[PDB]
Design a protein around this nucleic acid. Structure first.
Ligand SMILES: [Mg+2]
Ligand SMILES: [Mg+2]
Ligand SMILES: [Mg+2]
Ligand SMILES: [Mg+2]
Ligand SMILES: [Zn+2]
Ligand SMILES: [Zn+2]
Lengths: 365, 184, 365, 184
DNA sequence: CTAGCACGTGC
DNA sequence: GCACGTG
DNA sequence: TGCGAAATTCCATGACA
DNA sequence: ATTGTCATGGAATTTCGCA
DNA sequence: CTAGCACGTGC
DNA sequence: GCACGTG
DNA sequence: TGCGAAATTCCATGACA
DNA sequence: ATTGTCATGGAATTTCGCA
C-alpha cells in the first residue's frame, strides 16, 4: 500500500532513490548489488522475521542471513532484534556473553571472634562411624576448629559450637544457606547468645571463600597423610587442626596461631623472638601486627563485563535445571543494588531475593 | 629472669565426684598460669583415660611447655607420663599433701569451686549444660592484681561477652537451706 | 665438627666473616639481625628440614619460616627444595601452578567426508523407548546427522553408520575413547570399509570439540523447542537435524548444507543467488568457497605456561581419584612430543600412552 | 530456461515384492533428476506409511521442490498429498500406463533393477545388508552423457570409494540356471 | 555420561 | 559373574 | 571528499563435555 | 598413536547515500 | 555435598 | 508420609 | 658504590566449592 | 538482607657480603 509510491517513482524515507523498484509475480521487487530481493509490506514483515527466527531460534546475524536470502527492506536488523527481545525461549535458554564485574575483596575482620565462617565437608569415607566435618574459621586470624560429625545437622552444629564458644563468643557467624544453618532452631541458638547470623547469597560458594579455601587445605593435608593407607581420617583431625593452625602464610608472614595468641605454644619449631618482652609489650606488638596485615585489591575488570543498575532487567540462573530444560528464569527487575556484586531482585516466584551477580545475566535486546 | 607467658604452665586438677549430669561426674580443671584462662572438661572418672581424652582436645589448640598437678593417680600413671613425653610436655608435681600453684591460680581455682557450687544448688543434675557459661564467666572477669581479664591477656582484645556484673558468689539464705536438704 | 673452625675464628665458604659465632648449651650459635639462631652440623640438617616439612607438608617459604624460627645456615632453601623434590606425598597431591600452552587449531578438513567426528549424547529423558543420540559431524562442512539409540553400544553405532555411509564413505572417523568406538568389533567394521579410526587423547573432550560443540547446539534447540511441554525429543530429532544443517554460521557466512551441496534444497528461505548458473559453474564456485574459509589461530600463550620437552619429568592427572586420594600419578618421562600439546609417556603402569598436556603437570623441584 | 539443479525433482517408485529379507519386501527408489543420485529405502509394503516413514528420513537431509511418481496407490493417497503439502513439495504424476522421467532417470532406474537382480541371485534373502553397497556403486559410476558420477555432481568432489570396475551387470550361465530353479 | 544423597521446611 | 578403563 | 547512520565485522564469553 | 569450537550480541569499524 | 550409570575388555 | 530449596 | 649471588618478594594458577 | 581465598613455586626484584 505505502509501497505504491515506490513503483510510481516517488520517494519515501528509508528507501534510497537511486534504486529501481519494479513489479513481478504480484510482488514489489528491488535490484540490489547482491541480487534482486522481495520487499514485503510493513504489515507482513513482523511475521517474516518470526518465521525465519523460529526455524532454529537463531540470533541476530544468523536470523538476518535467512531473511536476506529472499527479502530486503530498510533497517531489517531493527525488526530482527525486536523479535529476539520477545522470544521467551531464546531469553531463557541462551547463554550470556557478558562477564560478571570484578570480585570484591571484603576487609579482613579487625579482631579475632568478630566473624566466624562455617561450613560442612562431606560425606567422607566412613571413619569410626563419622562422615562429616564442621569447619569453623575465624575471619581475622584464620585459626580453625575442626569438629567430626555423623550428619550436617543443626543439632550437631549446636553441640560442636557449644564446645568452641566455651573459649569465646563471636560477634557474627557467616555460613552458606545450608539447611543446618538456616533452621529456626539454629536461629534461636544464635539469638540466645547474641550472635548475629549472616548468610551467603545462594549457589555462590565464593562467598564462604574463607572457610571453603580452608577446606582445601584440610583435605590436601588429610590426603597426603593417608597416602598408601586406608582412608580413616577421624583420628587425624586433631593433628590436622593443630598442624594448620601453626602453618605460616607466606604472604602474611604469620601463622593463624600467632595471629590469635601473639605467641607460639609448645609446638615444634616454636618462634621465640619475644622471649625477652613482657606479655604487655607482646600484646601491643600483636596489635600493630593485626592492623598492618596485607590487604589484596579487586582485580581489573574484564573487557566485556556488566555491573547491575537499579531497574535493570536481569535473569537469575536456574539453580538445578532438569535435563533439556532452560538454565534461566524469566526476566526480573533489580530492586536494590547492595554493592557492585550483590543485588536484590523481585524473583520469578514474586519474592525479594538477595543474589550474587554471578548467578545473573542482563536480559538482552 | 624471662617474663611469664601463656602456655608456660597449665595447672590441672579434678573436681568431684559431683552429682551425675548427663552421665558425667567430674570436672577436669585446666588453668593457664600466666593469664588465668580456664578450660573445664567434664569426665566420667578421674582417670588417666579421661584426662587424656580431654587434654587431647585442649592440646589441638595449644600445647603447654609444662603441666603441673597434685600427685593424683590419674596424673602419676605411666600412661600419662608417656602421653606427656610424646608431646614434649614436662610434668611437674607438688609434693603430697602440700598443694602449690600461685596466688593467681589458687584464687581462680577457688573462684571455680565456689562458682560451680553456687549454680549446683537448684540444679544438682543440670551442671553439664552450664559448663560453657561458667568458663565464659571466669574468663571474662577482672583480676585484682592486674587490671586485665584472662580473655584480654590471652587474645589481646576485649571480649564480646563482658561480664560487667560481678555477683555475690556467696550463698543466700534460701540457697543454704535447700543445699542442706540435698543430703537428707 | 667442620663447625669447630668457626668457634675458633677461622673462615669457611658460606659463613660470612663479620658475624660472631659462639657456643651455648652445647650448641653452636650465631648472632643475626633477626635474633640469635642455632647452626646445626651438616649431618643434622637433612633431618631438620624433614621434620619441619612434615608438620603440615608445606612448600618452600612456609617450610623455611618454621626452620628459621630456631635455625640458620648457608643456603637453607637449597636444602629445603631438595626435600620438597623427594616428598612423594607433596608431588602427587599438590596442584600445578603452571598453565598449559596455547591450544592448537587444527586445519579444517579439505573435503567433505574427509573426517567425521562422532559422539554420544545421553542419557536423555526416555522418549518413545529411546535414551541416547549418536551425533555424527562432518569436519569440513559441519553437516550433522543425528541417530536416536537405546544404548551407546557398538552395535547401535554400526547400525546407525550403515545408514549414513549409504550416502558416502569417510576417510577418517574421529571419536573419544568411548567403549562403543574402541571395541574390536568397531575396529573391524571400520577396517572392512577402509575407514581409518582416530581417537582423542583420554579425558579430553576438547579433542572432539567439533562434535561436542555441535552437541551444545542440538541440546539448546531441543530445550527451546520443548519449553512448557514434556521433554519428549525423539520426534523432534529430524526437525533439529534439518534446522541446524541449514543454519548460517555468521563467521563463515554459510550453512553446513550450503557447504555440503553448494545449493539450498527446498527449505524455508532457500538461497537462490546461483539460479542462473549451470551446476558446473556452481560447483567451481563451491570449490573456491570451501578453500577460502576463515581459519582461526592459536591464542597468545599465558604469562606462566609450560610446553613439554622430550625427557622431561611429568605427571598424568589421576582420571577418577577416590575421595581423599591424590590427583596425580607418580612422575613419568616424556617419550615423544607429538605436538606442543600432545605427548607420549611411559605411564605409571609401564605402557606407552598418548595424553593431552591438559592432563599433565611438570614435576617440580 | 534456468539450468537443472539437484533437489529440483526426485523420482520415486517402488520395486517389489522381493523375497523377504530381514522382514522387508520392497525397495523405495529415490533418484535425483539432475545428478542421478540414488537413495534406496527398504519397506514392508508399497504403502503411504512406508513411503512417509522412509521419505521423512530423506527429507531431514534435503527437501525436493518436486516429487514425481507413477499413479501408484501409495503416492496418490490423500495422506501422501497432505504430507507433501505440509513440506511445500509439489507432487507430479505421469499419466497411467505411460511412465515418463528422462533418459538419465530411465537409465539409472534400469541399472538399479538390473543391479538388484544380479545380487539377488545367490542371495535371495540377504539383500537387506547389501543395500548400502548397491547405493554406493550406483552413485560412484560414470555417466555416458556427462563425464561425472552422481557423487561428483552432488558434492563437487571425488568419492573415497571410486568404483573403478564397471562389471558385467548381465547374468552368467550358472546364474541364469540357479535363478530359473528359484521358482521350482 | 547424569544421577543421587543430605537436612529443615511446609501440604 | 567382577574389577577396570573411559564417557 | 565529507557527514550521519546503517551495515558489517569483531570478538569475549560460555557451554559442549 | 595426536590437535578445541562456534553461536551470540554489544562495540568497533566500515560502507553507503547523499551532497 | 558425591554418588552412580553406561559399555567392552580381560580373570 | 512427599515435594522443594540449598549444599 | 659496584658486582654476583642469595634472599625475598611477586604473582598466576588452581581447588575449595 | 550482602561481599572470594590463599598455598605454591618459578621469576623478578632486592638485599647483602665484600671490595
Ligand atoms: Mg556448605
Ligand atoms: Mg585433685
Ligand atoms: Mg563421548
Ligand atoms: Mg511403481
Ligand atoms: Zn527464539
Ligand atoms: Zn610433603
Amino acid at each position: 500500500a505505502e509501497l505504491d509510491q515506490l513503483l510510481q517513482g516517488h520517494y519515501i524515507k528509508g528507501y534510497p532513490k537511486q534504486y529501481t523498484y519494479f513489479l513481478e509475480d504480484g510482488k514489489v521487487k528491488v535490484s540490489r548489488p547482491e541480487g534482486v530481493k522481495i520487499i514485503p509490506p510493513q504489515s507482513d514483515r513482523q511475521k517474516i522475521v518470526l518465521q525465519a527466527h523460529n526455524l532454529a531460534h537463531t540470533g541476530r546475524e544468523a536470523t538476518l542471513l535467512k531473511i536476506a536470502n529472499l527479502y530486503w527492506w530498510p533497517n531489517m536488523r531493527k525488526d530482527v532484534v525486536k523479535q529476539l527481545g520477545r522470544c521467551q525461549q531464546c531469553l531463557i535458554t541462551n547463554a550470556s556473553n557478558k562477564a560478571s564485574g570484578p570480585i570484591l575483596r571484603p576487609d579482613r575482620p579487625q579482631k579475632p571472634f568478630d566473624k566466624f565462617f562455617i561450613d560442612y565437608i562431606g560425606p567422607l569415607p566412613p571413619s569410626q562411624g563419622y562422615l562429616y566435618v564442621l569447619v569453623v574459621v575465624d575471619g581475622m586470624t584464620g585459626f580453625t576448629w575442626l569438629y567430626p560429625t555423623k550428619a550436617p545437622s543443626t543439632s550437631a552444629t549446636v553441640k560442636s559450637l557449644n564446645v568452641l564458644t566455651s573459649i569465646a563468643i563471636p560477634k557474627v557467624i557467616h555460613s552458606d544457606q545450608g539447611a543446618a544453618f538456616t533452621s529456626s532452631t539454629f536461629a534461636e541458638w544464635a539469638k540466645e547468645r547474641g550472635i548475629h547470623l549472616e548468610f551467603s547469597t545462594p549457589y555462590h560458594p565464593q562467598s564462604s571463600g574463607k572457610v571453603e579455601r580452608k577446606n582445601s587445605d584440610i583435605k590436601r593435608l588429610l590426603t597426603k597423610l593417608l597416602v598408601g593407607r586406608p582412608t580413616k581420617w577421624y583420628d587425624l583431625l586433631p593433628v590436622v587442626q593443630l598442624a594448620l593452625n601453626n602453618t605460616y602464610s607466606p604472604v602474611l608472614k604469620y601463622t593463624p596461631h600467632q595471629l590469635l595468641f601473639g605467641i607460639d605454644s609448645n609446638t615444634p619449631f616454636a618462634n621465640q623472638d619475644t622471649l625477652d618482652l613482657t606479655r604487655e609489650e607482646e600484646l601491643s606488638l600483636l596489635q600493630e601486627i593485626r592492623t598492618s596485615l596485607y590487604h589484596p585489591s579487586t582485580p581489573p575488570a574484564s573487557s566485556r563485563s556488566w555491573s547491575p543498575v537499579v531497574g535493570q532487567l536481569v535473569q537469575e540462573r536456574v539453580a538445578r535445571p532438569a535435563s533439556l530444560r532452560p538454565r534461566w528464569h524469566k526476566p526480573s527487575t533489580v530492586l536494590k543494588v547492595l554493592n557492585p556484586r550483590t543485588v536484590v531482585i523481585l524473583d520469578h516466584l514474586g519474592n525479594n531475593r538477595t543474589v550474587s551477580i554471578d548467578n545473573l545475566k542482563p536480559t538482552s535486546h | 629472669d624471662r617474663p611469664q607467658k601463656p602456655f608456660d604452665k597449665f595447672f590441672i586438677d579434678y573436681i568431684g565426684p559431683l552429682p551425675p549430669s548427663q552421665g558425667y561426674l567430674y570436672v577436669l580443671v585446666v588453668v593457664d598460669g600466666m593469664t588465668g584462662f580456664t578450660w573445664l572438661y567434664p569426665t566420667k572418672a578421674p582417670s588417666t583415660s579421661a584426662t587424656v581424652k580431654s587434654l587431647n582436645v585442649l592440646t589441638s589448640i595449644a600445647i603447654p611447655k609444662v603441666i603441673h598437678s597434685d600427685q593424683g593417680a590419674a596424673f602419676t600413671s605411666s600412661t600419662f607420663a608417656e602421653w606427656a613425653k610424646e608431646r614434649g610436655i614436662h610434668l611437674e608435681f607438688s609434693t603430697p599433701y602440700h598443694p602449690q600453684s600461685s596466688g593467681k591460680v589458687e584464687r581462680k581455682n577457688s573462684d571455680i569451686k565456689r562458682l560451680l557450687t553456687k549454680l549446683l544448688v537448684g540444679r544438682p543434675t543440670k551442671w553439664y549444660d552450664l559448663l560453657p557459661v561458667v568458663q565464659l564467666a571466669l574468663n571474662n572477669t577482672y583480676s585484682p592484681v592486674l587490671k586485665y581479664t584472662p580473655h584480654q591477656l590471652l587474645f589481646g582484645i576485649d571480649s564480646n561477652t563482658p561480664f560487667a556484673n560481678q555477683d555475690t558468689l556467696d550463698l543466700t539464705r534460701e540457697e543454704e537451706l535447700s543445699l542442706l536438704q540435698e543430703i537428707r
